[PDB]
Design a protein around this nucleic acid. Structure first.
Ligand SMILES: [Mg+2]
Ligand SMILES: [Mg+2]
Ligand SMILES: [Mg+2]
Ligand SMILES: [Mg+2]
Ligand SMILES: [Mg+2]
Ligand SMILES: [Mg+2]
Ligand SMILES: [Mg+2]
Ligand SMILES: [Mg+2]
Ligand SMILES: [Mg+2]
Ligand SMILES: [Mg+2]
Ligand SMILES: [Mg+2]
Ligand SMILES: [Mg+2]
Ligand SMILES: [Mg+2]
Ligand SMILES: [Mg+2]
Ligand SMILES: [Mg+2]
Ligand SMILES: [Mg+2]
Ligand SMILES: [Mg+2]
Ligand SMILES: [Mg+2]
Ligand SMILES: [Mg+2]
Ligand SMILES: [Mg+2]
Ligand SMILES: [Mg+2]
Ligand SMILES: [Mg+2]
Ligand SMILES: [Mg+2]
Ligand SMILES: [Mg+2]
Ligand SMILES: [Mg+2]
Ligand SMILES: [Mg+2]
Ligand SMILES: [Mg+2]
Ligand SMILES: [Mg+2]
Ligand SMILES: [Mg+2]
Ligand SMILES: [Mg+2]
Ligand SMILES: [Mg+2]
Ligand SMILES: [Mg+2]
Ligand SMILES: [Mg+2]
Ligand SMILES: [Mg+2]
Ligand SMILES: [Mg+2]
Ligand SMILES: [Mg+2]
Ligand SMILES: [Mg+2]
Ligand SMILES: [Mg+2]
Ligand SMILES: [Mg+2]
Ligand SMILES: [Mg+2]
Ligand SMILES: [Mg+2]
Ligand SMILES: [Mg+2]
Ligand SMILES: [Mg+2]
Ligand SMILES: [Mg+2]
Ligand SMILES: [Mg+2]
Ligand SMILES: [Mg+2]
Ligand SMILES: [Mg+2]
Ligand SMILES: [Mg+2]
Ligand SMILES: [Mg+2]
Ligand SMILES: [Mg+2]
Ligand SMILES: [Mg+2]
Ligand SMILES: [Mg+2]
Ligand SMILES: [Mg+2]
Ligand SMILES: [Mg+2]
Ligand SMILES: [Mg+2]
Ligand SMILES: [Mg+2]
Ligand SMILES: [Mg+2]
Ligand SMILES: [Mg+2]
Ligand SMILES: [Mg+2]
Ligand SMILES: [Mg+2]
Ligand SMILES: [Mg+2]
Ligand SMILES: [Mg+2]
Ligand SMILES: [Mg+2]
Ligand SMILES: [Mg+2]
Ligand SMILES: [Mg+2]
Ligand SMILES: [Mg+2]
Ligand SMILES: [Mg+2]
Ligand SMILES: [Mg+2]
Ligand SMILES: [Mg+2]
Ligand SMILES: [Mg+2]
Ligand SMILES: [Mg+2]
Ligand SMILES: [Mg+2]
Ligand SMILES: [Mg+2]
Ligand SMILES: [Mg+2]
Ligand SMILES: [Mg+2]
Ligand SMILES: [Mg+2]
Ligand SMILES: [Mg+2]
Ligand SMILES: [Mg+2]
Ligand SMILES: [Mg+2]
Ligand SMILES: [Mg+2]
Ligand SMILES: [Mg+2]
Ligand SMILES: [Mg+2]
Ligand SMILES: [Mg+2]
Ligand SMILES: [Mg+2]
Ligand SMILES: [Mg+2]
Ligand SMILES: [Mg+2]
Ligand SMILES: [Mg+2]
Ligand SMILES: [Mg+2]
Ligand SMILES: [Mg+2]
Ligand SMILES: [Mg+2]
Ligand SMILES: [Mg+2]
Ligand SMILES: [Mg+2]
Ligand SMILES: [Mg+2]
Ligand SMILES: [Mg+2]
Ligand SMILES: [Mg+2]
Ligand SMILES: [Mg+2]
Ligand SMILES: [Mg+2]
Ligand SMILES: [Mg+2]
Ligand SMILES: [Mg+2]
Ligand SMILES: [Mg+2]
Ligand SMILES: [Mg+2]
Ligand SMILES: [Mg+2]
Ligand SMILES: [Mg+2]
Ligand SMILES: [Mg+2]
Ligand SMILES: [Mg+2]
Ligand SMILES: [Mg+2]
Ligand SMILES: [Mg+2]
Ligand SMILES: [Mg+2]
Ligand SMILES: [Mg+2]
Ligand SMILES: [Mg+2]
Ligand SMILES: [Mg+2]
Ligand SMILES: [Mg+2]
Ligand SMILES: [Mg+2]
Ligand SMILES: [Mg+2]
Ligand SMILES: [Mg+2]
Ligand SMILES: [Mg+2]
Ligand SMILES: [Mg+2]
Ligand SMILES: [Mg+2]
Ligand SMILES: [Mg+2]
Ligand SMILES: [Mg+2]
Ligand SMILES: [Mg+2]
Ligand SMILES: [Mg+2]
Ligand SMILES: [Mg+2]
Lengths: 386, 197
RNA sequence: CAUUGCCGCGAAGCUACCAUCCGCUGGAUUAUGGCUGAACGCCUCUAAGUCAGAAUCCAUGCUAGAACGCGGUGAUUUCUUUGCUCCACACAAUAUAGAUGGAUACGAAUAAGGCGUCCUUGUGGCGUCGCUGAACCAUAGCAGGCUAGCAACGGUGCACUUGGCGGAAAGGCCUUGGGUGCUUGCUGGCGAAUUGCAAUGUCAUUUUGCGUGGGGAUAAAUCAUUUGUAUACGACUUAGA
RNA sequence: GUCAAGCGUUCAUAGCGACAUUGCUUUUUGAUUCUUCGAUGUCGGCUCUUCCUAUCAUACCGAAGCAGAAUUCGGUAAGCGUUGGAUUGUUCACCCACUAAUAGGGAACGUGAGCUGGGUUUAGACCGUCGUGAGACAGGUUAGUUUUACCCUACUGAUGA
RNA sequence: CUCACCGGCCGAAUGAACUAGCCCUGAAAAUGGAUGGCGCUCAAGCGUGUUACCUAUACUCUACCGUCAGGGUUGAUAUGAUGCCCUGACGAGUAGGCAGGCGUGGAGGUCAGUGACGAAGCCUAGACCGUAAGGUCGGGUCGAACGGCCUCUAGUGCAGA
RNA sequence: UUUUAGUGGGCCAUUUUUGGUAAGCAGAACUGGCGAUGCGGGAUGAACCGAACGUAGAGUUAAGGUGCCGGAAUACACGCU
RNA sequence: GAAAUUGUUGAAAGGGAAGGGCAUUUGAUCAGACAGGCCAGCAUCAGUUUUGGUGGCAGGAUAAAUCCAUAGGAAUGUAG
């Protein structure tokens, strides 16, 4: 007979299976639609999640009750050193889908990206791309034939970039290598842009602009095996229940004489690939810019880093992206920022954000001071040796 | 009688082609079918689209990954129609289905090879004029096939190349027919005409 | 010590509509309303054709990725009981969903076309063809031997080579020239027997190995230790001459 | 559903609709006794999933005795929702509210090695009626042990030649 | 301004009431699903007609096995008379009946049977005979007894309880 | 003519019937079946159609079929949808 | 010193059981003959069948038709 009372489903069946993602670097499964009138640009960028802070800004929302007043907003800071362009990849359209025709690599690759090709770098003779590097050596005619194949064929051009994870306060030293689509004009001109940018760096300023809605693609934080109560948000069973409370009581009817796929079960929670959309960029901060964290309204000489550093991350010495709100993944994680796949005209986009203040107190406690100068001015002088 | 037979599937009815191809496969003939997006099904498009959605409705209720696998491409619709005309769970029918290749468009090697028709299965020979019919590329696009535009682009390219082939082939058969006409009214050619040749 | 003795605060981590953030836009349609319009000289949303149109459907997008679906790319081990790869030819063993003259390439229409020719270059004129591949090409020679001329400068096999086109899986197609044979286009000479009146009477193409002689290259992965963005254990993500 | 006497200020058919009559369903209750008595765990609730459409709401429409507003009839449509409580073990009911709406059903009258055990249906006890009595009562009342998965599949995750 | 009516307008069929074939409406259920499936539309649908073809343990013919019947067969039946031969028909089977056989322990008789130069037992995708119950042989292992035939006898044959 | 086993729960179909709104319901009549029975066909099935069975061989058939699964005409013909 | 059950070696096969029946391939293994055994082919026959070609007859309205002659007639009317 029927359920006797209606309730909606627990959980979303479009995020199935709730398994561990295949890599720590989430895949960009769609790129923006190419307009061949625009100049050649990267559709995406790579960065690392440093952590969050909070801001104050005025609101430009006519009709809102909080129009032209201040609001406190959480912002996620993604540390974005410039990417190094090392390869190009050609893709032809086939009746079975998109197919990589060939890849052309740059002549010199750093040990950062070479270390990606090794499980055991410390024992290795480090032979990667040693015979490839001797195809540029005579005149590069074997490289120009492959680039001519990419120009002749290849309706889609993607570019290989890697992160500079040494510019980044992590103990990893092995770069993340990714394929970013080249949007813009003329497949030939895409190949020319990529060959010009071989061994070069693309900064996040020349890809992303302020007040841009972007998408974050990241693998979420892992939690291991989880019961159904937190994995799907089902109701807990009463206190009187024998054999445990943290369970789904009925896991099926007698017929179909099988547990159905829509029934909620214990399993892996987190470390899933997520693409979250429409996060607005609030600051594209330069790295060679003292006063990363100053605004036009504050002008206190301070960087984006909190006192004591970002917790578990470290300092930011690089360019960063201050994006509004929450994005998947935890701190230290590689995250791919992508352009918006559609043109949004929703009045929460197209709002020009001007920060009034960025919080830089310690996240390692309940911080009280924004700068050590403020701390010294409040507390006076202590016992600590001069 | 050929080592493989290449059927141009354009203007063919899907069941009347699939039963013929199923019998050729089981009798030991290797069959490759091309231009499966140009196949026909009799009856109107909304008729056959409701038939596909009725098929699309049925799946295993406890696990949709073990259900009937609703394959969307026109070559796969032809393959599904031709399974069920073959005992495909036996080793003999598995070996028969290994003799069949079905493609959308005409890709390589087969684009420089002779394509045949099966006149038992031709729509213009079987359907009464006025009877509506469905094109399998349009039906596949409606039920979720992604590659109708790519196949059309490649088929336009292939037809431009094939017409440049055929212009040279007519230019050669002009000369060959004229040179055979010069050898006519000779004592060897009248001798051959006395024997039906 | 009081099975964390108790009380206040308490970082970190986890967590809460008890906190924040974010949750896309195109196509085809249903009902229905229409257009043109016959049947039925009128009319008519319908019969042929056609427009719009729903929280629908299918895409876009989002999750997983076939552990027997696929692609691209990097490196590929000798001073290591001389290992690895490629090329060629000698012999073995495995087999074979089944060689036995050739899978012989327009596209479109089918109440229409193909071919040839001509002009005004068209949705043209004229002629011709179909009524099946019952075709076309190929096909003579000890499973095809040895040899002599005639005519022609054609045809064809194999390697060498020039140039070009082909990415849907191109892995093929078209060429330029020189060798190198053969030629049944025509006319001759020699041989075949006894496989004893038939007994596929063995002539195909994949895997491999091993032998010989000719090139080529000179690595990684895993355990163990380590990390914690990970985690029941595996696995994952890091580090280490 | 058909037919349409009649109602609907005139007007059969906007909405209805008598006397008749044709069906569908299997969520009611009977009818039967085919399966199970070397046992298929017997009510309700809780939890949780899916399915149906005879659509309450939401989307788009057609009709009205549709001026507006609010309604009513009908179409496509099950995409998405369909509540919080008082009393009762209840199913059902009834009321207070809130809501866009608080539609109807199925899945062994879904679901007990998922729970719970209020009810019913063992053994204790009381009452009323019946019975001479022992005792009876689909009459009332109160108390009354809820066992086992580590196997196979299925499912959820996790490795892997 | 509206009608039964008409012509300088046209240019050959038209109207009404029915009858019944197919199709459509009436036609709504619950896991996803069933002309058996795939599919199929001058069909691979419906109605009908004519031929060809396919194939049952059925029919025809022949062989062999059994059974039953009806016969033949004695003066070397050119030595097997519940024997041999001829002719014909027939052959499903639970419960059940009857017959002819196979096998096991023990007893009387016989083969002046087998055996430490290897009895019995046991193992053997080795062989032979029998429709079968079974019987026989070869090889391995083994170490003391055991077979055939004619009869007698029973505590005589196992997959289940 | 003697002797003796098993059985003494039946069930289905056509036709004729009774009770019941009806039932794969309950109860009778006649025959044929299943039980007790395989085989070919009806996809599947105790009972329907066909046909009942020693072991084989060849031929022809029944019922049912002949697009393909699947042996056998994508037969021929007149229409209807 | 049997079986169940197990180890090792050998052989073989293995996409959601395995096992079995008919038939053959392949592999393994095994019995046998001539002093005519096996397996075949051809011819001429016999038995049972299947598929063709072709000859001569019989019947019916002693086919009906066509054809030939003759009479009459029309129209989907030929020439004038
Ligand atoms: Mg409900
Ligand atoms: Mg709901
Ligand atoms: Mg939900
Ligand atoms: Mg639910
Ligand atoms: Mg994993
Ligand atoms: Mg993944
Ligand atoms: Mg390392
Ligand atoms: Mg290289
Ligand atoms: Mg946790
Ligand atoms: Mg939990
Ligand atoms: Mg949450
Ligand atoms: Mg709750
Ligand atoms: Mg709770
Ligand atoms: Mg309890
Ligand atoms: Mg159960
Ligand atoms: Mg679970
Ligand atoms: Mg679990
Ligand atoms: Mg903190
Ligand atoms: Mg089938
Ligand atoms: Mg061709
Ligand atoms: Mg599509
Ligand atoms: Mg999809
Ligand atoms: Mg002490
Ligand atoms: Mg103590
Ligand atoms: Mg203490
Ligand atoms: Mg206290
Ligand atoms: Mg959480
Ligand atoms: Mg989008
Ligand atoms: Mg319409
Ligand atoms: Mg219309
Ligand atoms: Mg129409
Ligand atoms: Mg029109
Ligand atoms: Mg439209
Ligand atoms: Mg894979
Ligand atoms: Mg490789
Ligand atoms: Mg012409
Ligand atoms: Mg012309
Ligand atoms: Mg390609
Ligand atoms: Mg020759
Ligand atoms: Mg962690
Ligand atoms: Mg761990
Ligand atoms: Mg009705
Ligand atoms: Mg009225
Ligand atoms: Mg029992
Ligand atoms: Mg149970
Ligand atoms: Mg409805
Ligand atoms: Mg409605
Ligand atoms: Mg709404
Ligand atoms: Mg739903
Ligand atoms: Mg819903
Ligand atoms: Mg209450
Ligand atoms: Mg209460
Ligand atoms: Mg009830
Ligand atoms: Mg309200
Ligand atoms: Mg039900
Ligand atoms: Mg039920
Ligand atoms: Mg129950
Ligand atoms: Mg129940
Ligand atoms: Mg229950
Ligand atoms: Mg139950
Ligand atoms: Mg249960
Ligand atoms: Mg319980
Ligand atoms: Mg219960
Ligand atoms: Mg109780
Ligand atoms: Mg007692
Ligand atoms: Mg009691
Ligand atoms: Mg009393
Ligand atoms: Mg009394
Ligand atoms: Mg009680
Ligand atoms: Mg008590
Ligand atoms: Mg219980
Ligand atoms: Mg279990
Ligand atoms: Mg355990
Ligand atoms: Mg399991
Ligand atoms: Mg009618
Ligand atoms: Mg079906
Ligand atoms: Mg079925
Ligand atoms: Mg069927
Ligand atoms: Mg059919
Ligand atoms: Mg018929
Ligand atoms: Mg026959
Ligand atoms: Mg027979
Ligand atoms: Mg005999
Ligand atoms: Mg008989
Ligand atoms: Mg008998
Ligand atoms: Mg006997
Ligand atoms: Mg005894
Ligand atoms: Mg004895
Ligand atoms: Mg004695
Ligand atoms: Mg001795
Ligand atoms: Mg012995
Ligand atoms: Mg013994
Ligand atoms: Mg044995
Ligand atoms: Mg032995
Ligand atoms: Mg001894
Ligand atoms: Mg002894
Ligand atoms: Mg002895
Ligand atoms: Mg005994
Ligand atoms: Mg006994
Ligand atoms: Mg027995
Ligand atoms: Mg027994
Ligand atoms: Mg026993
Ligand atoms: Mg008796
Ligand atoms: Mg009885
Ligand atoms: Mg009865
Ligand atoms: Mg009985
Ligand atoms: Mg019978
Ligand atoms: Mg039948
Ligand atoms: Mg049958
Ligand atoms: Mg049936
Ligand atoms: Mg009969
Ligand atoms: Mg029989
Ligand atoms: Mg056949
Ligand atoms: Mg011993
Ligand atoms: Mg044993
Ligand atoms: Mg044993
Ligand atoms: Mg053991
Ligand atoms: Mg073992
Ligand atoms: Mg498996
Ligand atoms: Mg052999
Ligand atoms: Mg023998
Ligand atoms: Mg022999
Ligand atoms: Mg003869």
């Amino acid at each position: 007979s029927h359920r006797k009372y209606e309730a909606p489903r627990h959980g979303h069946l479009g995020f199935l299976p709730r398994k561990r993602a295949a890599s720590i670097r989430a895949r960009v499964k769609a790129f923006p639609k190419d307009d061949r009138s625009k100049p050649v640009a990267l559709t995406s960028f790579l960065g690392y999640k440093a952590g969050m802070t909070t801001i104050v800004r005025d609101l430009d929302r006519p009709g809102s009750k909080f129009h032209k007043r201040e609001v406190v907003e959480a912002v996620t800071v993604v540390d974005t050193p410039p990417v190094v362009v090392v390869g190009v990849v050609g893709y032809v359209e086939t009746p079975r889908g998109l197919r990589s025709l060939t890849t052309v690599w740059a002549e010199h690759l750093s040990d950062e990206v070479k270390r990606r090709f090794y499980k055991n770098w410390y024992k290795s003779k480090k032979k990667a791309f040693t015979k490839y590097s001797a195809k540029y050596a005579q005149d590069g005619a074997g490289i120009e034939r492959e680039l001519a194949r990419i120009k002749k064929y290849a309706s889609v051009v993607r570019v290989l970039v890697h992160t500079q994870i040494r510019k980044t306060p992590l103990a990893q030293k092995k770069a993340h290598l990714a394929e970013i689509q080249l949007n813009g004009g003329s497949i030939s001109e895409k190949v020319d842009w990529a060959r010009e940018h071989f061994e070069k760096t693309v900064a996040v300023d020349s890809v992303f602009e302020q007040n841009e809605m972007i998408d974050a693609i990241a693998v979420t934080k892992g939690h291991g095996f989880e019961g159904v109560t937190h994995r799907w948000g089902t109701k807990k069973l009463p206190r009187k229940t024998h054999r445990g409370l943290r369970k789904v009581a009925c896991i099926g009817a007698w017929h179909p004489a099988h547990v159905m796929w829509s029934v909620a079960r214990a399993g892996q929670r987190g470390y899933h690939s997520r693409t979250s959309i429409n996060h607005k960029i609030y600051r594209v901060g330069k790295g060679d810019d003292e006063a990363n964290g100053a605004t036009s309204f504050d002008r206190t000489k301070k960087t984006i880093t909190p006192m004591g550093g970002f917790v578990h991350y470290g300092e930011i010495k690089n360019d960063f992206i201050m994006v509004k709100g929450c994005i998947p993944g935890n701190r230290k994680r590689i995250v791919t920022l992508r352009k918006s796949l559609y043109t949004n005209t929703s009045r929460k986009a197209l709002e020009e954000v001007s920060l009034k203040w960025i919080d830089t107190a310690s996240k390692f406690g309940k911080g009280r001071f924004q700068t050590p100068a403020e701390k010294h001015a409040f507390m006076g002088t202590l016992k600590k040796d001069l | 009688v050929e080592p493989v037979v290449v059927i141009d599937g354009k203007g063919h009815l899907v069941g009347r082609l699939a039963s013929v191809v199923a019998k050729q496969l089981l009798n030991g003939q290797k069959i490759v079918v091309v231009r499966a997006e140009e196949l026909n099904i009799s009856g109107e498009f909304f008729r056959n689209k409701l038939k596909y959605h009725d098929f699309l409705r049925k799946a295993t209720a406890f696990n949709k990954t073990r259900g009937p696998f609703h394959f969307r491409a026109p070559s796969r619709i032809f393959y599904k129609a031709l399974r069920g005309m073959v005992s495909h769970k036996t080793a003999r029918g598995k070996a028969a289905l290994e003799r069949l290749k079905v493609f959308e468009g005409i890709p390589p090697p087969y684009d420089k090879k002779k394509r045949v028709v099966v006149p038992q299965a031709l729509r213009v020979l079987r359907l009464k004029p006025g009877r509506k019919y469905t094109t399998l590329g349009k039906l596949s696009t409606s039920v979720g096939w992604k590659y109708e535009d790519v196949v059309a682009k490649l088929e336009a390219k292939r037809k431009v190349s094939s017409a440049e082939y055929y212009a040279k082939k007519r230019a050669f058969t002009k000369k060959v027919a004229s040179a055979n006409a010069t050898a006519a009214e000779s004592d060897v050619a009248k001798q051959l005409a006395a024997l039906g040749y």
